[PDB]
Amino acid sequence: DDYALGSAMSNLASTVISSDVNTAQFTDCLLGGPLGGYFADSNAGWSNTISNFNATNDWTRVFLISDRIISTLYGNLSTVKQVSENTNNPVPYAIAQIIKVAAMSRVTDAYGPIPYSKIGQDGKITIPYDTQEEVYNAFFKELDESIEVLTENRNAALVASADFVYSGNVQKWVKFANSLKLRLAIRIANVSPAKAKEMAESAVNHELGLIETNADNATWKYFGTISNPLFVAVRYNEEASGGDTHPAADIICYMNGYNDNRRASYFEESKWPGETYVGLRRGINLSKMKEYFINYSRVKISSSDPVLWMNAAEVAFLRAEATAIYGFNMKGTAADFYEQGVRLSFEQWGATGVDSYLADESSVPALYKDPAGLNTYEKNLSAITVKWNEGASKEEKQERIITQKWIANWPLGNEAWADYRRTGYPKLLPATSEGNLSGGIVDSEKGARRMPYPSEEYTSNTENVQEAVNSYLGGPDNMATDVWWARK
Amino acid sequence: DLTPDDYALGSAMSNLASTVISSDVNTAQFTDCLLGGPLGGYFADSNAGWSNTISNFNATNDWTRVFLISDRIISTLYGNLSTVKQVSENTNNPVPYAIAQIIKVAAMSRVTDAYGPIPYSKIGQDGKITIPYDTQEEVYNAFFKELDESIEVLTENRNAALVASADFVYSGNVQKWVKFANSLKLRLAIRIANVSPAKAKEMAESAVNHELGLIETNADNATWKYFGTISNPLFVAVRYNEEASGGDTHPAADIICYMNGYNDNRRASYFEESKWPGETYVGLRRGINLSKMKEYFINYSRVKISSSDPVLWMNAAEVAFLRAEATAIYGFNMKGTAADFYEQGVRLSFEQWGATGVDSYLADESSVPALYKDPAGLNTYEKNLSAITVKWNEGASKEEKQERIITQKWIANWPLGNEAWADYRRTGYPKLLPATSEGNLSGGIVDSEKGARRMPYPSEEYTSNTENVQEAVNSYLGGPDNMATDVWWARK
Numbered sequence: 001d002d003y004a005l006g007s008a009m010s011n012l013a014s015t016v017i018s019s020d021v022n023t024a025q026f027t028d029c030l031l032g033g034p035l036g037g038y039f040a041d042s043n044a045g046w047s048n049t050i051s052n053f054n055a056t057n058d059w060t061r062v063f064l065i066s067d068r069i070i071s072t073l074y075g076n077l078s079t080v081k082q083v084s085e086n087t088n089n090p091v092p093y094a095i096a097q098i099i100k101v102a103a104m105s106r107v108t109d110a111y112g113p114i115p116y117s118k119i120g121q122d123g124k125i126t127i128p129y130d131t132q133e134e135v136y137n138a139f140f141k142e143l144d145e146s147i148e149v150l151t152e153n154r155n156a157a158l159v160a161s162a163d164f165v166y167s168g169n170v171q172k173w174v175k176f177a178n179s180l181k182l183r184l185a186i187r188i189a190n191v192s193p194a195k196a197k198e199m200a201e202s203a204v205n206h207e208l209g210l211i212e213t214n215a216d217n218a219t220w221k222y223f224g225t226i227s228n229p230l231f232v233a234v235r236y237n238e239e240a241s242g243g244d245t246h247p248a249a250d251i252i253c254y255m256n257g258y259n260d261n262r263r264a265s266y267f268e269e270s271k272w273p274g275e276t277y278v279g280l281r282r283g284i285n286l287s288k289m290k291e292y293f294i295n296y297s298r299v300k301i302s303s304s305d306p307v308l309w310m311n312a313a314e315v316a317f318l319r320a321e322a323t324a325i326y327g328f329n330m331k332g333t334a335a336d337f338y339e340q341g342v343r344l345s346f347e348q349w350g351a352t353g354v355d356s357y358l359a360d361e362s363s364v365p366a367l368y369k370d371p372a373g374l375n376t377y378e379k380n381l382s383a384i385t386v387k388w389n390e391g392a393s394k395e396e397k398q399e400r401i402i403t404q405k406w407i408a409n410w411p412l413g414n415e416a417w418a419d420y421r422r423t424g425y426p427k428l429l430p431a432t433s434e435g436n437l438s439g440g441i442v443d444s445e446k447g448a449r450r451m452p453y454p455s456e457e458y459t460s461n462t463e464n465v466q467e468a469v470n471s472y473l474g475g476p477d478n479m480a481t482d483v484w485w486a487r488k
Numbered sequence: 489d490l491t492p493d494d495y496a497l498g499s500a501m502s503n504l505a506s507t508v509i510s511s512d513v514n515t516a517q518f519t520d521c522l523l524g525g526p527l528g529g530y531f532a533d534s535n536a537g538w539s540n541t542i543s544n545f546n547a548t549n550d551w552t553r554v555f556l557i558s559d560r561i562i563s564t565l566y567g568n569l570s571t572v573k574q575v576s577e578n579t580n581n582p583v584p585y586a587i588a589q590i591i592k593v594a595a596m597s598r599v600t601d602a603y604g605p606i607p608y609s610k611i612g613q614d615g616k617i618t619i620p621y622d623t624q625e626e627v628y629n630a631f632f633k634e635l636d637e638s639i640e641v642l643t644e645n646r647n648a649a650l651v652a653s654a655d656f657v658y659s660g661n662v663q664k665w666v667k668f669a670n671s672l673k674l675r676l677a678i679r680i681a682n683v684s685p686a687k688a689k690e691m692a693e694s695a696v697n698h699e700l701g702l703i704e705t706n707a708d709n710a711t712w713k714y715f716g717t718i719s720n721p722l723f724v725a726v727r728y729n730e731e732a733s734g735g736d737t738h739p740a741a742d743i744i745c746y747m748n749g750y751n752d753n754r755r756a757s758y759f760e761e762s763k764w765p766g767e768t769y770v771g772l773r774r775g776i777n778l779s780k781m782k783e784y785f786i787n788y789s790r791v792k793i794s795s796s797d798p799v800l801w802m803n804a805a806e807v808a809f810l811r812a813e814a815t816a817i818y819g820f821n822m823k824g825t826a827a828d829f830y831e832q833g834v835r836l837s838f839e840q841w842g843a844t845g846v847d848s849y850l851a852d853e854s855s856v857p858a859l860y861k862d863p864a865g866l867n868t869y870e871k872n873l874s875a876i877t878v879k880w881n882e883g884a885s886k887e888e889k890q891e892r893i894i895t896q897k898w899i900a901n902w903p904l905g906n907e908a909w910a911d912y913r914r915t916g917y918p919k920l921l922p923a924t925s926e927g928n929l930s931g932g933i934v935d936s937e938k939g940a941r942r943m944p945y946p947s948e949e950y951t952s953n954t955e956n957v958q959e960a961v962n963s964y965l966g967g968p969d970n971m972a973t974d975v976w977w978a979r980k
């Protein structure tokens with residue numbers, strides 16, 4: 001029962017989704033959530049937001065600049081490394097490296113090229129950037145090292161107090177490492193198919209497997225005495241608006257159309273007459289909605305809830321896409337993996353009626369008729385249905401997999417955003433004409449493709465950030481330019 | 489445009505399927521109601537008029553010979569294999585024969601598992617067994633070779649299909665057939681894991697490495713969906729003489745004792761309620777004095793079954809439990825963990841039968857199998873059954889882990905008596921009740937605590953194939969031709 005390792009491990013865990021409310025608000029409530037189609041901003045006082053594409057630097061820089069992310073990560077990695085090397089015990093540092101990848105994947109996925117390999121002990125980013133490809137190559141190398149070490153020490157354990165993800169269970173850490181490896185492999189499957197295949201198939205071939213049961217979901221079980229940060233953030237200003245962040249129209253439209261029994265687990269009911277679940281539209285004129293925010297459905301969440309990093313459902317949907325779209329050898333069939341993912345999701349949230357849900361070949365995502373009468377979407381959403389069809393086209397299979405993966409990944413907005421950019425699925429609603437404050441830079445139908453680099457970097461690391469933009473980014477440093485694995 | 493081989497194929501494929509568990513009521517009664525069921529701990533005989541049975545260990549030859557002698561099994565199998573082979577070879581389409589060979593292994597594994605050494609490799613086109621026997625080891629080696637051929641061919645042709653009418657197991661879905669072949673390969677690998685560990689490892693690990701995987705979902709369970717117009721044969725057999733006895737076969741005390749003790753929500757799917765006051769589920773004891781029970785059979789719980797039900801060959805739950813044992817007991821590389829596989833098997837089973845409350849069930853570390861207090865007051869078991877509990881314990885001993893896996897696999901394999909019987913003989917689990925003193929009519933040959941270890945060879949073979957069956961007994965069996973001698977994979 002050591003404070004120093006314990007404190008370090010928790011610090012590392014916090015660099016994924018921070019326990020600091022305002023940091024988590026920025027990374028996941030105001031950025032990930034809306035860009036991934038789960039959340040919608042709901043504070044009339046915000047004249048500049050990420051969702052409206054006119055965000056100021058203090059909103060966009062957080063992943064790359066916040067002390068609670070990179071500086072904290074590398075400072076604490078160094079501590080755990082010392083402990084491992086000075087107690088001749090490689091387990092703690094191997095687990096720390098897995099958390100490193102979980103944290104920094106979100107960072108590169110937000111900006112594209114980033115400092116990574118050249119970040120020294122001190123955690124400073126005043127050094128040359130890596131290409132996003134080099135970053136991903138290092139991720140794979142790092143995960144493989146951790147997997148090898150932990151598998152050699154599969155019967156070892158961390159103390160429970162040093163691990164509120166898995167209570168020091170080394171085998172679950174290996175499963176998460178293989179699972180994360182599969183996520184990142186599929187991430188690069190369009191741009192780097194041979195590498196993706198090798199990493200995807202390697203993950204599934206490992207003797208300890210992936211996250212296959214909800215009992216092994218990667219969630220940070222840190223809260224109860226300390227409040228869940230997402231809880232506090234989305235509940236801010238509750239009395240006036242119902243909350244600073246509401247569930248998005250998109251997710252609720254899909255789930256309403258499918259009569260999805262998971263809705264009761266995701267959302268609180270709206271105050272709009274006749275409509276149990278109503279989401280708030282993203283990329284809208286916020287000032288006009290001041291008086292109406294409070295009527296929409298809200299995020300169902302408790303101050304003691306764990307924070308999700310990755311679930312068993314996603315792993316099934318990854319294997320489904322790996323086989324069906326990319327032709328990788330996943331030791332199974334797409335039809336099985338798709339249904340297993342949906343079943344795992346229903347079970348995760350305690351919803352019943354999955355059989356009828358999986359048999360539904362006629363229900364489609366619902367229209368968005370705005371009960372406030374301000375942001376009604378005049379067109380139809382996708383006609384993609386639930387029931388697996390083996391004879392369907394590749395495009396339909398991919399839309400089917402990603403749509404269900406997306407629903408099942410509530411509320412992992414950053415992951416949903418990455419999948420939306422890689423695949424184009426699910427078919428998210430566009431920003432409105434008034435809500436797109438990009439001055440023409442952002443296409444309302446495509447949304448934000450990345451965050452711009454921090455102004456701090458142009459000031460203090462000028463030559464290096466300019467190299468990244470001129471040599472690695474393949475476009476201007478704005479929200480319209482796609483990242484490497486998303487380039488079409 | 490339809491040709492003779494289109495028609496020949498449909499009839500042939502259904503014929504082959506019927507050689508696993510027959511659609512003929514009396515054949516199925518013998519193979520699975522009177523033999524498999526009781527010996528596996530699922531079923532119990534319940535006809536006061538039967539003075540000679542397999543469960544009492546004094547069965548006559550007409551009961552014991554059926555697997556090896558019945559025309560509805562071997563003769564039908566090899567006759568129809570020959571037909572499908574011709575179709576494949578003369579239409580340049582290897583899919584039908586590859587599927588047929590999988591069914592062959594499903595059918596004949598039950599036969600060798602019943603007797604030990606059997607005729608196999610030397611059975612010619614005509615389906616006659618008047619030839620030299622194979623050792624059980626040679627039979628299993630051939631099974632693996634045959635499954636591997638089928639898997640290779642079907643995987644090369646994974647997007648091909650049989651017509652639906654030629655396949656009431658999988659409706660011609662080639663990939664499901666591969667999954668069943670890999671699954672059957674894993675079953676047979678684990679079967680031989682005590683006696684042939686190196687071979688078992690190779691076959692088990694090979695099965696799970698295959699690109700199309702195993703049976704993982706209940707939608708892909710191997711069941712023969714042949715009934716509805718034709719009555720399920722198990723339904724008819726267990727319901728025989730219903731008005732007097734409630735049925736010729738009742739659920740066994742063993743299975744109900746375990747499930748009652750665990751408050752198992754699958755009971756409502758397995759059994760009909762008893763007529764005994766205060767006891768919803770009560771099983772009938774196996775290996776008892778039947779004449780004394782004449783007036784009481786009707787009060788026990790019954791097999792819950794319908795005339796249109798498919799007949800089960802293998803389910804997704806078993807595959808999970810096989811992988812659980814492969815990793816935990818035998819140290820094979822199953823690309824996962826025993827804890828996961830055990831829970832997945834139990835979840836698949838609950839889902840298969842529409843039962844809820846699996847989370848609470850899997851969290852139960854205190855409930856134990858119940859005692860057997862016979863409400864008739866004749867065959868009460870005075871001792872305690874095993875104290876094995878449900879909840880997975882990673883720190884438990886190997887022996888406890890194996891008992892835990894096999895016990896849940898066994899419950900989940902209702903009513904695959906022949907498979908349960910094989911697992912009981914290989915592992916000693918679950919801890920089945922012994923025959924009673926009065927119920928053991930073996931004249932001392934069968935140990936009441938161990939039960940029947942095999943069927944004796946047919947008398948027909950001593951008459952018409954004397955030299956060959958004598959060779960099997962003297963050279964291959966390693967013991968006398970009776971119910972006490974263990975088969976090769978069960979030898980300690």
Ligand SMILES: [Zn+2]
Pocket residue numbers: 131134
């Ligand atoms: Zn470079």
Ligand SMILES: [Zn+2]
Pocket residue numbers: 333335336705707708
């Ligand atoms: Zn399937």
Ligand SMILES: [Zn+2]
Pocket residue numbers: 489490491494
């Ligand atoms: Zn034809």
Ligand SMILES: [Zn+2]
Pocket residue numbers: 557558559563
């Ligand atoms: Zn005959």
Ligand SMILES: [Zn+2]
Pocket residue numbers: 704
């Ligand atoms: Zn699996």
Ligand SMILES: [Zn+2]
Pocket residue numbers: 213215216825827828
């Ligand atoms: Zn697990």
